[PDB]
Amino acid sequence: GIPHDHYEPRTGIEKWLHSRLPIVALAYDTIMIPTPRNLNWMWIWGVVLAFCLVLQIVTGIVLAMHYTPHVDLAFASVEHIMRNVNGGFMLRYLHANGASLFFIAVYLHIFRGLYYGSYKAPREVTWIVGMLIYLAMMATAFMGYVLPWGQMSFWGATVITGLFGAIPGIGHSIQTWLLGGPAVDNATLNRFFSLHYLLPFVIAALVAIHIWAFHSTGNNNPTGVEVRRTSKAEAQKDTVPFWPYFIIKDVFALAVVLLVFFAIVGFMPNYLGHPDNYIEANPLSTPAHIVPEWYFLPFYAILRAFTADVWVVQIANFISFGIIDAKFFGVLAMFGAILVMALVPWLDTSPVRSGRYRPMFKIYFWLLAADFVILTWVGAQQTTFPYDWISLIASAYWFAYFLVILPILGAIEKPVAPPATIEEDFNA
Amino acid sequence: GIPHDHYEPRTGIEKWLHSRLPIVALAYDTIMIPTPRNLNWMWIWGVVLAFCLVLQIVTGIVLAMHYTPHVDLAFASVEHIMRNVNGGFMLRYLHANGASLFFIAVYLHIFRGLYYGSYKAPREVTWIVGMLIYLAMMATAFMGYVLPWGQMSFWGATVITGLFGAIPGIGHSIQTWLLGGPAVDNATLNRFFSLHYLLPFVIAALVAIHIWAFHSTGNNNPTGVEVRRTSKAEAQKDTVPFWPYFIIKDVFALAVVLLVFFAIVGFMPNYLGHPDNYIEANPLSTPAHIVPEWYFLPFYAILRAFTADVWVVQIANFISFGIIDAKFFGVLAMFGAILVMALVPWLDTSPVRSGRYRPMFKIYFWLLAADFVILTWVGAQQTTFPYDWISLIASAYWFAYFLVILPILGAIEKPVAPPATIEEDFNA
Amino acid sequence: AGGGHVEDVPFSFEGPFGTFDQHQLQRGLQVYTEVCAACHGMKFVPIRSLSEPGGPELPEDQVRAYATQFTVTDEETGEDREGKPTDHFPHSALENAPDLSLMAKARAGFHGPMGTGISQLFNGIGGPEYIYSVLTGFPEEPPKCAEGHEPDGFYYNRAFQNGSVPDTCKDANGVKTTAGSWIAMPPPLMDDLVEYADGHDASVHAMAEDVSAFLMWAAEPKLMARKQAGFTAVMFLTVLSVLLYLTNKRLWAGVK
Amino acid sequence: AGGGHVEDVPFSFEGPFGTFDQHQLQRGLQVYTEVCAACHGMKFVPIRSLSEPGGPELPEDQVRAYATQFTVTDEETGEDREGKPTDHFPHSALENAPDLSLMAKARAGFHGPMGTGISQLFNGIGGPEYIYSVLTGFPEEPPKCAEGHEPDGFYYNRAFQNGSVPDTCKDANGVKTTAGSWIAMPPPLMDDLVEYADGHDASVHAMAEDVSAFLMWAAEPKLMARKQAGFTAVMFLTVLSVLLYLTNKRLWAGVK
Amino acid sequence: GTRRDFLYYATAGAGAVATGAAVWPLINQMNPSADVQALASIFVDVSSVEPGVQLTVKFLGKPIFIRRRTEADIELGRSVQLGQLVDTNARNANIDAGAEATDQNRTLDEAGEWLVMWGVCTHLGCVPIGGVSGDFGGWFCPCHGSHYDSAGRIRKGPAPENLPIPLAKFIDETTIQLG
Amino acid sequence: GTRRDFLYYATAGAGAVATGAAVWPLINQMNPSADVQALASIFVDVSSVEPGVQLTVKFLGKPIFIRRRTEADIELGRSVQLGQLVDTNARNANIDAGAEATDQNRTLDEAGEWLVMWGVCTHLGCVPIGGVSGDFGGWFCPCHGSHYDSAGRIRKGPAPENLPIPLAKFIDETTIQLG
Ligand code: HEM
Ligand code: HEM
Ligand code: HEM
Ligand code: HEM
Ligand code: HEM
Ligand SMILES: C/C=C(C)/C=C/C=C/[C@H](OC)[C@@H](C)[C@@H](OC)[C@@H](C)CCc1oc2c(O)c(OC)cc(OC)c2c(=O)c1C
Ligand SMILES: C/C=C(C)/C=C/C=C/[C@H](OC)[C@@H](C)[C@@H](OC)[C@@H](C)CCc1oc2c(O)c(OC)cc(OC)c2c(=O)c1C
Ligand SMILES: CCCCCCCCO[C@@H]1[C@@H](O)[C@H](O)[C@@H](CO)O[C@H]1O
Ligand code: FES
Ligand code: FES
Ligand SMILES: [Sr+2]
Ligand SMILES: [Sr+2]
């Protein structure tokens, strides 16, 4: 909504085309949008995600060209891709590790938002849509991981469909529908394939809206101070056109990211993975060392922190006449952790946008970040003492942050003064 | 753009949402566009296509959930769908016949355009994008038809990949790449599956642009006379808001179309099909009665009309040192027939939009339509006399129409006067 | 070759209201079992469907008893065993005997007229009639023209349009004189070759007509479900069309 | 169970520059063939890959001769025939002998430290070392705590972390005393059990270390391809990064 | 008058009706297909099974354990008190629906030697490890840390119930008929 | 000065280079994989084949006809003027690349009894019908109407060449080695 100059048809073809389908003008306004001068290296995860989505989609289509979604051939079919398909081994490892890169990026993308208040008015829709992508992403990655049909694939498939068979009443129905049978079997693999293919396109469409969302409000900068919109004159004092300034840092940033990424795929392709998925799915035994995918660990930690012996669970069990047992409580905790995060635009009562100028906020924020790391770390630890306590304190801190701390800091906290203008911040 | 009224946020949620993501305003302007009052039943094929695309996509995703794309299981997998999957038999027959409904509609959609000059300035982009959808549609339907892996599936697969191995020089390469091998085999089936899934989404995106295209110029009406844009006052005398007038007409039209369509699927599901595809693909024998899908017949007719003993082929052959032989000439004729059609905005030199007011034009137009029917009809006939002559005269008339007749009528022709305004036509 | 003409049988299932005749299919299953099955198989037909509604609808324990006769290489045990209703009928025992699972859908008997297919728009595809006609069409005497030139191993059949025909039976232009051709399938139906249970007549005509209906079901087991689904849908829509037609008429009247 | 500790072997292929040792893989293939193959199979390994670059790289006619010793059930003939290089090594002959096709990737040997996996970020997954250690780890004497409680049929192995351990070998809390556990695989390597061609030493250590590298290749045949691809990519990017970095610095300087 | 405002309802209603007739099957196609619903009832030879040995068997796509318990297993099993459990229901399809999680109420025989149950954790599905694994001499589910005693009763973790027992009965001297 | 305008090219160039290194493999993955390329060389027993009988055999995923011709087939074959053929090349991988479409140049034996060729129409791939079909006493391709004579030579239709003959030779009294 900043003050600028729109596309002006100059060429001959350009004037012909423009009067019929102003598609060139649209592309123009999308990459000629005035962007704040002070953006830092935390604003480059959006485009790393773009890349990731595109990378996954094309490598996916390619991979789907050699993959057979049927329990008798799926695992064999992926080895075929590793051993026979020209550059298959590389295409596989790229789709795989591509997933990890996709998540490393969202978390950074997300936490960037949490710290700078990019989710605060008028950016709530950008934020909500974002959350939808996140769920879609997770669902997608989940189904994809099942396709190889290795051990981690099968049991992961079992445990996740199982989550729905924990919903009181309708539960076993929903679960039998997801499985198309009494167990995880071909019918399950076959429909996951179809959905794994379909979801990325939904994410893509959502991303379109996501983009549209922030172009409508303008991007938030590290100072939380809006761009001046009283005259192109001062508006330009706070901004610089997206092209070529940000298009270039993006490509630069992408090259550095891809450098590390390719180093990973080239030299340590199986680090971020689980050795057990190189073992064909066995429906009669679950690997003693089964473990969710690292990007799923934090939420998996929250889920199994809640066993029968936990008080809050017991209170709930008793208070609901036994409906909310440990099983269902863990499930509600996990999705609740995500849902709570989606509600932050409303749980956060401080009127100050950037956490840069919030003294108390900062401590809780970093505790949150540390907590996220800790949760991911416990996810891989056993359930014995003291991991059970650590996972518990951690889960507790998570909800405490969105439900209690942020709402309270809204009043308690006495914030520092932010720059008067982006221009002023950029110069200083 | 016709003078209409902007969206206006009234609700409470509506004002909140609108200032953040004006998505509601967009949807508004898309279905609140002033449309000419005189549109006739020939303008309802656009929405029948919309329906068809959506129908194919959802039935496709569903079907992809039970289908195994591997020569050893694909055919068995589709019978499984017919005999075991709840409502599978119906879902299959619906995707199948859905294809036929998709084409019956484009042809009517296309011929509507040819007659009313809906392809004539400033609607060239709408037209070109349309042509792209058409190619995409054909490619999609082609790959889909291969999936069952029946006799017609295999040989259809052979003959069509073969078309590319007729390109001088690069030909055998392109063809080997499309097949991933020395013959049509699993590698081919497997990649067709992936592409069949992917293409519909491309069509969808193109359709988005298609729509955007005519909303930019306004829809053409049966009189070829534009809507008045000098004042909302008279603009409304020529138009009526899309909602509820055309939204309703459309649902009404859709109900009637679907009525016939369901009667087809319910009672004669295999009429528009080929009995041989109920026979498993045999790479060692081609059914004596092999025959392209009816929606492919007209162009297939043009291709095999050109044998060695056709003098223009003989001329062309010699005048090009044996490069352009019968084989490659037929191929060029077929794609040329389509390409020529895509060029009509430029081959048509008459300044009069609607063919309603073009006396000579009509005769040639109806001959074209009859020719299309005739071509479809010969496609199913043998190559013996007199079908060889009929296919030939027919192909000749096709190119004669776009290349010679239309350019010439631009000068020769003496056109009738069209209504002064849509209002005037609507009333009269 | 070409598409010939077949005997038009008035099967119960034809017409938008037609439906299978449960007992007929039962008889048909018997003909298939005691006669055809010796050479032909039905690999896409799960035995347990002999129990599903819309077909022969035998009682589950019968079906279970039936599957007994077949020998199936158990997919795990790798060992042979009896047949369970979860098993499919076996593959054709005779190498060149086509699979009969879809045969009634993989054949047309009403070809034409003039490639316009207007003949099917009214006569259907004719798969069952076709099959019927082939079981019928095995004449005792070889057509004249072939008197002493019958390819050893084949049999003349008046419905078959894809067999070889002795040179001595073609015309000046290579076309065949005969209405049919030579098929590798020896005549299969002899009078009262199947001792029907309820006594029903086992005349080659009858058996042939029964086994045909069976095969029509074996190919389109969901024939009735589809038609009901069809009828239902046509109904909603006819009604819905009328309402919308009136709603549209009403709505537009305020314009013209 | 848990993830233990394995003997750290300095294989040729480790490191961004490591590559297989053609002769080693050759020796390994021999160990596998004359020893392991008796119980283990490699169903995902096409014999013809013994010829492809980046591996043992045997001459096609040798490979063809090799595939001979295998009896394979054709995929049409239904019969048995000699192995063609287009065939995969067979399935494990011994029901409970796991497939070795991917074994070197199916195991990790560098677990930890503290679940942080920082140990692998530097040590890799240790699959080959793991396999090595298992062939190594067969002590002549069973750890003390098991003295008279050795599960018959099993064998104590120092590297194995997923076997059973006699109760008399666990501590107050149920944990095991032993470093390893009881595996169902009897010791496979005896000194000079394989007669190498070039005379090379066939000490249990050596054989074990060779067969391991073979298996590392059998699981990652495109290892070298991957690293070259990797090195290449890192190069484009390092260069491209620098240019873009300068292009960006130049471009932005007009602002700061 | 209200013939048109009725028309709206008759229409809108007809629509919604169709809209649902369309949707239900899109949803229903995903429910178990005819080939899956073909639930049978296998038989298992046990003549081989020495005591202290578990037998894993496939059935309906999930495993079913058949362990011949030792004195110790039967011992610890019986020494537990109904009130000491997490789930008092016997979860036995053979006996009464309301029976109690008593060690006798969990075995097929009276000597309490044949424990037969689904090896399907009641938490989220994994297959608990036997061989006396866990902190209650039974099974341990590696997925989220559930422990089961020598009777397959849940004693700790997130699992809410005891491993189910299916219709299982001895068909003779040495053969159990599951299903 | 031009260090930056050079920078642009060093950059733009580096980009385009990568862009291609990326694209080529996306394209190349679709080329025949390592398992396909395993082209062998089968053998066929012919001892059975009476004259006037065609034998269809699979090889490289397409058919290969092996017809033992009759006197008639060999006559019509020989009574043909190279000037009347649509393709004069023998299309025989056994003999010289430039040989001519003469009947003798199309059979394996001299009596002109063994016709061996790919049953792959040269137009677009279908399998032409044998048993002396078509106007020229040979084969007829139902896909677009190509006719071939008793030597498998194209005499009419859109097919541009004669059915190819692969490396085929008699390994002995009664066995041809294709491939
Ligand atoms: C049992 C009454 C029976 C039926 C029914 C039946 C049908 C049948 C059809 C429809 C065909 C296909 C012909 C075509 O391609 O259009 C067919 C073909 C063959 N049959 Fe048959 N057949 C029945 C029984 C038997 C029996 C008992 C044998 C074996 C003695 C047999 C054999 C064959 C063979 C061989 C063929 C294919 C040869 C050919 O000419 O195509 N049939 N049959
Ligand atoms: C498909 C993954 C996603 C992609 C491709 C994507 C892309 C982008 C891009 C390009 C930007 C602008 C550049 C930047 O600031 O990095 C952006 C901004 C943003 N994204 Fe995302 N995003 C994704 C997921 C998410 C998720 C999961 C959230 C968290 C719910 C989120 C929240 C935001 C927010 C709050 C902004 C700030 C917008 C503003 O400043 O007005 N995004 N995103
Ligand atoms: C939203 C982006 C996507 C994500 C996050 C994603 C994630 C994943 C993951 C985690 C796997 C398992 C990889 C492994 O085997 O280690 C996978 C596999 C697969 N994905 Fe995707 N995927 C995405 C998009 C796609 C698309 C658009 C397709 C469409 C064809 C696709 C097709 C496949 C196929 C065929 C496999 C199986 C082969 C394999 O194991 O790699 N993916 N995906
Ligand atoms: C997915 C297939 C397609 C869909 C869904 C689609 C849809 C539509 C719709 C909704 C309209 C407006 C209503 C009407 O007049 O029918 C339209 C207009 C039109 N379409 Fe398409 N169309 C498709 C394919 C094509 C093709 C293949 C052509 C042929 C080039 C084409 C040419 C046109 C033209 C000339 C117009 C008139 C534009 C104007 O009045 O400004 N369309 N199409
Ligand atoms: C662009 C709209 C589409 C068209 C015109 C189309 C057309 C076709 C055709 C002609 C067939 C062969 C039908 C037959 O067996 O007789 C087919 C099969 C199939 N299509 Fe599509 N399709 C479309 C979209 C889709 C989509 C989006 C998917 C996957 C999401 C899909 C999945 C399938 C599958 C799995 C089959 C094989 C099963 C079958 O034989 O019906 N289709 N399609
Ligand atoms: C047809 C579409 C379907 C079925 C969509 C389902 C979507 C579900 C959710 O997506 C929104 C879900 C993926 C998301 O929950 C928010 C994740 C954080 C779940 C985290 C997750 O992972 C596991 C895993 O990966 C495993 O592998 C071996 C094993 C697991 O237990 C041992 C887990 C597990 O215990 C949990 C909680
Ligand atoms: C991987 C993606 C690929 C390879 C996409 C390729 C797309 C190609 C074209 O779409 C643009 C193509 C479908 C379109 O040409 C304009 C059609 C009119 C071709 C018509 C067509 O059909 C046949 C057919 O169906 C057959 O069996 C039922 C058999 C056939 O001969 C015997 C034919 C045939 O002779 C022709 C010309
Ligand atoms: C920022 C990330 C940099 C990554 C550099 C990775 C160098 C990896 O080098 C790896 C070793 O770590 C691994 O143990 C062996 C196993 O064979 O393979 C090598 O390529
Ligand atoms: S599934 Fe067993 S503990 Fe969770
Ligand atoms: S492919 Fe044989 S005539 Fe066309
Ligand atoms: Sr009839
Ligand atoms: Sr090492």
PDB file of all heavy atoms in Angstrom, chain A residues 56 60-61 64 92 95-96 140 144 148 196-197 200, ligand 3:
ATOM      1  N   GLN A  56      11.155 -29.468  -4.384  1.00  0.00           N
ATOM      2  CA  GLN A  56      10.422 -30.677  -4.033  1.00  0.00           C
ATOM      3  C   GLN A  56       9.449 -31.073  -5.131  1.00  0.00           C
ATOM      4  O   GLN A  56       9.372 -32.249  -5.500  1.00  0.00           O
ATOM      5  CB  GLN A  56       9.648 -30.490  -2.729  1.00  0.00           C
ATOM      6  CG  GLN A  56      10.516 -30.411  -1.480  1.00  0.00           C
ATOM      7  CD  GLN A  56      11.378 -31.646  -1.274  1.00  0.00           C
ATOM      8  OE1 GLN A  56      12.600 -31.593  -1.413  1.00  0.00           O
ATOM      9  NE2 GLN A  56      10.741 -32.765  -0.941  1.00  0.00           N
ATOM     10  N   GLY A  60       9.884 -34.252  -7.227  1.00  0.00           N
ATOM     11  CA  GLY A  60       8.817 -35.174  -6.917  1.00  0.00           C
ATOM     12  C   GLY A  60       8.208 -35.751  -8.176  1.00  0.00           C
ATOM     13  O   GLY A  60       8.088 -36.976  -8.324  1.00  0.00           O
ATOM     14  N   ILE A  61       7.817 -34.872  -9.100  1.00  0.00           N
ATOM     15  CA  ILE A  61       7.221 -35.299 -10.368  1.00  0.00           C
ATOM     16  C   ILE A  61       8.162 -36.290 -11.034  1.00  0.00           C
ATOM     17  O   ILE A  61       7.748 -37.371 -11.477  1.00  0.00           O
ATOM     18  CB  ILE A  61       6.986 -34.100 -11.302  1.00  0.00           C
ATOM     19  CG1 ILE A  61       6.115 -33.071 -10.602  1.00  0.00           C
ATOM     20  CG2 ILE A  61       6.338 -34.579 -12.605  1.00  0.00           C
ATOM     21  CD1 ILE A  61       5.815 -31.844 -11.448  1.00  0.00           C
ATOM     22  N   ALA A  64       8.182 -39.534  -9.148  1.00  0.00           N
ATOM     23  CA  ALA A  64       6.922 -40.255  -9.320  1.00  0.00           C
ATOM     24  C   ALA A  64       6.908 -41.003 -10.648  1.00  0.00           C
ATOM     25  O   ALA A  64       6.074 -41.883 -10.869  1.00  0.00           O
ATOM     26  CB  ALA A  64       5.751 -39.298  -9.261  1.00  0.00           C
ATOM     27  N   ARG A  92      16.805 -38.758  -5.584  1.00  0.00           N
ATOM     28  CA  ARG A  92      16.221 -39.290  -4.359  1.00  0.00           C
ATOM     29  C   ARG A  92      16.765 -38.450  -3.207  1.00  0.00           C
ATOM     30  O   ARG A  92      16.034 -37.670  -2.590  1.00  0.00           O
ATOM     31  CB  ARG A  92      16.643 -40.764  -4.194  1.00  0.00           C
ATOM     32  CG  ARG A  92      15.826 -41.582  -3.199  1.00  0.00           C
ATOM     33  CD  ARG A  92      16.366 -41.510  -1.772  1.00  0.00           C
ATOM     34  NE  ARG A  92      15.333 -41.883  -0.808  1.00  0.00           N
ATOM     35  CZ  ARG A  92      15.089 -43.121  -0.387  1.00  0.00           C
ATOM     36  NH1 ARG A  92      15.812 -44.140  -0.836  1.00  0.00           N
ATOM     37  NH2 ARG A  92      14.114 -43.332   0.489  1.00  0.00           N
ATOM     38  N   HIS A  95      15.363 -35.042  -2.903  1.00  0.00           N
ATOM     39  CA  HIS A  95      13.971 -34.895  -2.479  1.00  0.00           C
ATOM     40  C   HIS A  95      13.947 -35.087  -0.964  1.00  0.00           C
ATOM     41  O   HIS A  95      13.305 -34.333  -0.229  1.00  0.00           O
ATOM     42  CB  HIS A  95      13.092 -35.947  -3.150  1.00  0.00           C
ATOM     43  CG  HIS A  95      11.631 -35.645  -3.074  1.00  0.00           C
ATOM     44  ND1 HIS A  95      11.063 -34.537  -3.666  1.00  0.00           N
ATOM     45  CD2 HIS A  95      10.613 -36.318  -2.491  1.00  0.00           C
ATOM     46  CE1 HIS A  95       9.759 -34.543  -3.456  1.00  0.00           C
ATOM     47  NE2 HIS A  95       9.456 -35.614  -2.743  1.00  0.00           N
ATOM     48  N   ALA A  96      14.662 -36.109  -0.508  1.00  0.00           N
ATOM     49  CA  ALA A  96      14.745 -36.430   0.913  1.00  0.00           C
ATOM     50  C   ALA A  96      15.268 -35.235   1.702  1.00  0.00           C
ATOM     51  O   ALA A  96      14.506 -34.547   2.382  1.00  0.00           O
ATOM     52  CB  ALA A  96      15.659 -37.637   1.113  1.00  0.00           C
ATOM     53  N   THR A 140       2.007 -33.317   4.187  1.00  0.00           N
ATOM     54  CA  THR A 140       2.740 -33.727   2.990  1.00  0.00           C
ATOM     55  C   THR A 140       3.992 -34.542   3.316  1.00  0.00           C
ATOM     56  O   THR A 140       4.137 -35.675   2.846  1.00  0.00           O
ATOM     57  CB  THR A 140       3.163 -32.519   2.144  1.00  0.00           C
ATOM     58  OG1 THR A 140       2.000 -31.789   1.733  1.00  0.00           O
ATOM     59  CG2 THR A 140       3.908 -32.996   0.905  1.00  0.00           C
ATOM     60  N   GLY A 144       4.777 -38.437   2.332  1.00  0.00           N
ATOM     61  CA  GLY A 144       5.916 -38.721   1.484  1.00  0.00           C
ATOM     62  C   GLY A 144       6.808 -39.771   2.104  1.00  0.00           C
ATOM     63  O   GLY A 144       7.168 -40.759   1.462  1.00  0.00           O
ATOM     64  N   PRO A 148       8.510 -44.907   0.656  1.00  0.00           N
ATOM     65  CA  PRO A 148       9.590 -45.902   0.519  1.00  0.00           C
ATOM     66  C   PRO A 148       9.156 -47.289   1.010  1.00  0.00           C
ATOM     67  O   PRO A 148       9.624 -48.316   0.500  1.00  0.00           O
ATOM     68  CB  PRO A 148      10.707 -45.318   1.373  1.00  0.00           C
ATOM     69  CG  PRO A 148      10.539 -43.859   1.166  1.00  0.00           C
ATOM     70  CD  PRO A 148       9.025 -43.679   1.281  1.00  0.00           C
ATOM     71  N   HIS A 196      -0.001 -37.369  -1.472  1.00  0.00           N
ATOM     72  CA  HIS A 196       1.320 -36.747  -1.409  1.00  0.00           C
ATOM     73  C   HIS A 196       1.530 -35.939  -2.671  1.00  0.00           C
ATOM     74  O   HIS A 196       2.141 -34.870  -2.647  1.00  0.00           O
ATOM     75  CB  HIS A 196       2.443 -37.795  -1.279  1.00  0.00           C
ATOM     76  CG  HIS A 196       3.806 -37.193  -1.090  1.00  0.00           C
ATOM     77  ND1 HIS A 196       4.055 -36.225  -0.144  1.00  0.00           N
ATOM     78  CD2 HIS A 196       4.986 -37.401  -1.732  1.00  0.00           C
ATOM     79  CE1 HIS A 196       5.322 -35.858  -0.213  1.00  0.00           C
ATOM     80  NE2 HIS A 196       5.914 -36.549  -1.170  1.00  0.00           N
ATOM     81  N   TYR A 197       0.997 -36.444  -3.771  1.00  0.00           N
ATOM     82  CA  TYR A 197       1.125 -35.771  -5.050  1.00  0.00           C
ATOM     83  C   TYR A 197       0.272 -34.504  -5.058  1.00  0.00           C
ATOM     84  O   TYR A 197       0.733 -33.435  -5.465  1.00  0.00           O
ATOM     85  CB  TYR A 197       0.665 -36.708  -6.172  1.00  0.00           C
ATOM     86  CG  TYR A 197       1.198 -36.340  -7.533  1.00  0.00           C
ATOM     87  CD1 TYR A 197       1.814 -37.289  -8.344  1.00  0.00           C
ATOM     88  CD2 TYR A 197       1.089 -35.036  -8.010  1.00  0.00           C
ATOM     89  CE1 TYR A 197       2.308 -36.941  -9.598  1.00  0.00           C
ATOM     90  CE2 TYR A 197       1.581 -34.680  -9.259  1.00  0.00           C
ATOM     91  CZ  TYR A 197       2.186 -35.637 -10.048  1.00  0.00           C
ATOM     92  OH  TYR A 197       2.666 -35.306 -11.295  1.00  0.00           O
ATOM     93  N   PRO A 200       1.141 -30.815  -2.369  1.00  0.00           N
ATOM     94  CA  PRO A 200       2.081 -29.751  -2.745  1.00  0.00           C
ATOM     95  C   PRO A 200       1.443 -28.652  -3.587  1.00  0.00           C
ATOM     96  O   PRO A 200       1.842 -27.488  -3.497  1.00  0.00           O
ATOM     97  CB  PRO A 200       3.164 -30.507  -3.500  1.00  0.00           C
ATOM     98  CG  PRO A 200       3.202 -31.815  -2.760  1.00  0.00           C
ATOM     99  CD  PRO A 200       1.720 -32.139  -2.640  1.00  0.00           C
TER     100      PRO A 200
HETATM  101  C1  HEM G   3       5.426 -30.273  -0.475  1.00  0.00           C
HETATM  102  C2  HEM G   3       6.827 -30.645  -0.944  1.00  0.00           C
HETATM  103  C3  HEM G   3       7.088 -31.994  -0.692  1.00  0.00           C
HETATM  104  C4  HEM G   3       7.568 -32.510   0.462  1.00  0.00           C
HETATM  105  C5  HEM G   3       7.712 -31.773   1.791  1.00  0.00           C
HETATM  106  C6  HEM G   3       7.840 -33.907   0.213  1.00  0.00           C
HETATM  107  C7  HEM G   3       8.409 -34.770   1.138  1.00  0.00           C
HETATM  108  C8  HEM G   3       8.728 -36.093   0.874  1.00  0.00           C
HETATM  109  C9  HEM G   3       9.428 -36.971   1.789  1.00  0.00           C
HETATM  110  C10 HEM G   3       9.874 -36.667   3.221  1.00  0.00           C
HETATM  111  C11 HEM G   3       9.613 -38.139   1.128  1.00  0.00           C
HETATM  112  C12 HEM G   3      10.445 -39.303   1.578  1.00  0.00           C
HETATM  113  C13 HEM G   3      11.824 -39.166   0.977  1.00  0.00           C
HETATM  114  C14 HEM G   3      12.695 -40.362   1.229  1.00  0.00           C
HETATM  115  O1  HEM G   3      12.442 -41.412   0.603  1.00  0.00           O
HETATM  116  O2  HEM G   3      13.629 -40.256   2.054  1.00  0.00           O
HETATM  117  C15 HEM G   3       9.009 -37.997  -0.162  1.00  0.00           C
HETATM  118  C16 HEM G   3       8.966 -39.007  -1.110  1.00  0.00           C
HETATM  119  C17 HEM G   3       8.396 -38.911  -2.355  1.00  0.00           C
HETATM  120  N1  HEM G   3       7.808 -37.779  -2.842  1.00  0.00           N
HETATM  121 FE1  HEM G   3       7.669 -36.029  -1.976  1.00  0.00          FE
HETATM  122  N2  HEM G   3       7.495 -34.259  -1.091  1.00  0.00           N
HETATM  123  C18 HEM G   3       7.026 -33.086  -1.637  1.00  0.00           C
HETATM  124  C19 HEM G   3       6.491 -32.982  -2.903  1.00  0.00           C
HETATM  125  C20 HEM G   3       6.324 -34.019  -3.786  1.00  0.00           C
HETATM  126  C21 HEM G   3       5.558 -33.905  -5.004  1.00  0.00           C
HETATM  127  C22 HEM G   3       4.908 -32.649  -5.542  1.00  0.00           C
HETATM  128  C23 HEM G   3       5.518 -35.132  -5.579  1.00  0.00           C
HETATM  129  C24 HEM G   3       4.685 -35.424  -6.704  1.00  0.00           C
HETATM  130  C25 HEM G   3       5.197 -36.578  -7.558  1.00  0.00           C
HETATM  131  C26 HEM G   3       6.319 -36.010  -4.694  1.00  0.00           C
HETATM  132  C27 HEM G   3       6.601 -37.340  -4.930  1.00  0.00           C
HETATM  133  C28 HEM G   3       7.329 -38.159  -4.083  1.00  0.00           C
HETATM  134  C29 HEM G   3       7.639 -39.529  -4.368  1.00  0.00           C
HETATM  135  C30 HEM G   3       7.297 -40.297  -5.644  1.00  0.00           C
HETATM  136  C31 HEM G   3       8.298 -40.003  -3.300  1.00  0.00           C
HETATM  137  C32 HEM G   3       8.810 -41.425  -3.142  1.00  0.00           C
HETATM  138  C33 HEM G   3      10.248 -41.606  -3.562  1.00  0.00           C
HETATM  139  C34 HEM G   3      11.221 -41.272  -2.450  1.00  0.00           C
HETATM  140  O3  HEM G   3      11.318 -42.080  -1.504  1.00  0.00           O
HETATM  141  O4  HEM G   3      11.876 -40.209  -2.514  1.00  0.00           O
HETATM  142  N3  HEM G   3       6.792 -35.309  -3.587  1.00  0.00           N
HETATM  143  N4  HEM G   3       8.469 -36.737  -0.333  1.00  0.00           N
END
